[PDB]
Amino acid sequence: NPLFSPYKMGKFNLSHRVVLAPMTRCRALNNIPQAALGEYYEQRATAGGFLITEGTMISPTSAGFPHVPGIFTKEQVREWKKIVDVVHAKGAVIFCQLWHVGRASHEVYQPAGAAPISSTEKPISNRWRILMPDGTHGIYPKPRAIGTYEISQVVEDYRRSALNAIEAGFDGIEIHGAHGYLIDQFLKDGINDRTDEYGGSLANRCKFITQVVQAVVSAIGADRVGVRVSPAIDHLDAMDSNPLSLGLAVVERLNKIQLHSGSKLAYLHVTQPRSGGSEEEEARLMRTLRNAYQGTFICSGGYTRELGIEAVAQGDADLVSYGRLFISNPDLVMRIKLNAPLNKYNRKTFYTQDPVVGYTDYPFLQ
Numbered sequence: 001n002p003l004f005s006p007y008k009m010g011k012f013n014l015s016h017r018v019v020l021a022p023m024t025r026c027r028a029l030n031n032i033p034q035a036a037l038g039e040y041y042e043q044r045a046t047a048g049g050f051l052i053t054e055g056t057m058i059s060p061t062s063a064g065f066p067h068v069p070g071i072f073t074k075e076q077v078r079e080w081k082k083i084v085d086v087v088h089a090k091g092a093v094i095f096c097q098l099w100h101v102g103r104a105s106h107e108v109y110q111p112a113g114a115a116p117i118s119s120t121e122k123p124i125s126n127r128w129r130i131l132m133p134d135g136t137h138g139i140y141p142k143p144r145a146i147g148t149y150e151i152s153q154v155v156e157d158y159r160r161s162a163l164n165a166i167e168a169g170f171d172g173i174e175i176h177g178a179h180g181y182l183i184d185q186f187l188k189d190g191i192n193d194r195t196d197e198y199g200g201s202l203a204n205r206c207k208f209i210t211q212v213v214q215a216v217v218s219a220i221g222a223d224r225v226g227v228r229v230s231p232a233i234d235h236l237d238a239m240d241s242n243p244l245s246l247g248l249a250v251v252e253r254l255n256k257i258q259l260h261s262g263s264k265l266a267y268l269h270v271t272q273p274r275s276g277g278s279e280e281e282e283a284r285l286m287r288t289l290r291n292a293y294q295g296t297f298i299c300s301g302g303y304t305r306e307l308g309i310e311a312v313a314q315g316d317a318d319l320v321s322y323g324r325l326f327i328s329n330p331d332l333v334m335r336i337k338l339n340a341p342l343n344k345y346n347r348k349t350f351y352t353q354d355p356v357v358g359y360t361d362y363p364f365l366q
C-alpha cells in the first residue's frame with residue numbers, strides 16, 4: 001500500500017500519506033475554539049499523520065460561516081493551544097488553515113453589519129445562498145472593493161495570524177486561496193476586474209496571493225507554510241477563463257518565492273472539481289500543475305482508498321487529503337490500511353452547532 005510509505009514534508013517525517021482535509025464544522029461557538037474541537041481532532045490524529053484544521057479567521061471581518069474559530073485574539077490562541085497539545089500527544093502534525101471569506105459573507109457575520117470586503121463590488125450571484133446562524137439561507141450582499149492600503153493590511157492580518165498559530169504550537173499554517181473566497185476573488189478573471197496593479201493582467205491578479213505567501217513565509221519560514229488553490233473549481237462564481245494557465249501562473253510564483261527565500265514551501269494543496277466522462281481531462285490538469293511545481297503536492301477532492309492509492313502509485317501526488325470520509329470515519333487511516341468498510345456521513349450535521357451529534361459520535365472500528 002503506497003499510502004503508508006514514509007514521506008518527508010518540510011522538516012516533518014510522516015508515517016503515511018492520508019491527510020485530514022480542512023473542514024469547517026461550525027462547532028467553535030463565538031469564534032472561540034471549544035473542547036469539542038479537541039475531542040474531534042484527537043479522534044482523527046495518528047502517529048505521524050498530517051492534519052489540517054478547519055478554516056480559521058484572520059480578522060473580525062474574515063468570517064462567512066457561523067461559529068468558525070479564530071486565531072487573531074489571545075483568547076483564541078490559548079484555546080487553540082490545548083487542542084494542539086492533545087493532537088501532538090498522539091504524534092501527529094497539525095496545520096492551521098488561515099481563511100478569509102472575502103465577499104462570501106453577510107452583514108450578520110460582519111462587525112456593525114458592515115459590507116464584506118473583496119477585490120470588486122460584484123456580488124455573488126443569486127444562484128448561491130449563504131447559510132445563516134438560524135439555519136436558513138440568505139442573500140450575498142454587495143461587497144466593498146478595497147484599495148491597496150487595505151490590501152497590505154489584510155496581508156498584515158495573515159502574517160499576524162501565522163505568528164499566533166505558531167504561538168499556539170501549530171506546526172505550520174495553510175493559506176486558503178481556493179473555493180472562491182478572498183484570495184480566489186483576486187485570482188479569477190470572472191471576479192477580478194480591477195484597473196489597478198492588482199487586476200487586469202494574469203501577473204497582476206496573482207499579486208495578492210504572492211504577497212500573502214511572501215508575508216507568512218517571512219514570518220514563520222517557508223517550511224511551515226502550505227498553500228491551497230482550486231483553479232478548476234467554480235464555487236461561488238469563481239470562474240477563470242483559463243484555469244490551467246491560472247494554476248501554472250500561481251505555481252510559477254510559488255517556485256519563485258522558494259528560489260528567492262532559499263527554502264521550499266511545505267506543500268501545494270489543490271482540490272479538483274471531480275464531476276461523467278471528463279475524468280481524464282481533470283486528471284491531466286492536476287498532473288500538469290504537479291509536474292510544474294518544485295515541491296510537495298497534495299491532491300484533494302472526491303478521493304477514495306483506491307483512487308488515493310493510485311494517486312501515489314503513478315506519482316500524481318505525494319499526499320492525499322480526505323474530506324467527508326474523515327467526518328464519518330475518525331479512524332479513517334486505520335480503515336484504509338486494513339481495507340475495512342467505511343461508514344456513511346450525515347450531511348445534515350455538517351454545519352450544526354452540537355458538540356457531539358454528527359461531530360464526535362461517529363464510532364471507531366470494533
Ligand SMILES: NC(=O)C1=CN([C@@H]2O[C@H](COP(=O)(O)OP(=O)(O)OC[C@H]3O[C@@H](n4cnc5c(N)ncnc54)[C@H](OP(=O)(O)O)[C@@H]3O)[C@@H](O)[C@H]2O)CCC1
Pocket residue numbers: 024055099178179235273274275302324347
Ligand atoms: N471553507 C471552505 O473552503 C468550504 C469548502 N466547501 C466546498 O464548496 C462547495 C459547497 O459544498 P456544500 O456543503 O454547500 O454542498 P455540496 O458539496 O456542494 O453538494 C451538495 C449535494 O450535492 C451532492 N453531490 C453530488 N455529487 C457531488 C460531488 N461531486 N461533490 C460534492 N457533492 C456532491 C452531495 O452529496 P454528498 O452529501 O456529498 O454525498 C450533496 O447532497 C463544496 O464543493 C465544498 O467542497 C464547503 C464549504 C466550506
Ligand SMILES: Cc1cc2nc3c(=O)[nH]c(=O)nc-3n(C[C@H](O)[C@H](O)[C@H](O)COP(=O)(O)O)c2cc1C
Pocket residue numbers: 021022023024025054055097099176178228271300301302303321322323324325350351
Ligand atoms: C462540510 C465541508 C466543510 C469544508 N470546509 C473547508 C474549509 O474550511 N477549508 C477548505 O479549504 N476546504 C473545506 N472543505 C473542502 C474539503 O476540504 C475538500 O476540498 C473536499 O471536501 C475533499 O473532497 P472529499 O470530501 O470528497 O474528500 C469543506 C468541505 C465540506 C464538505
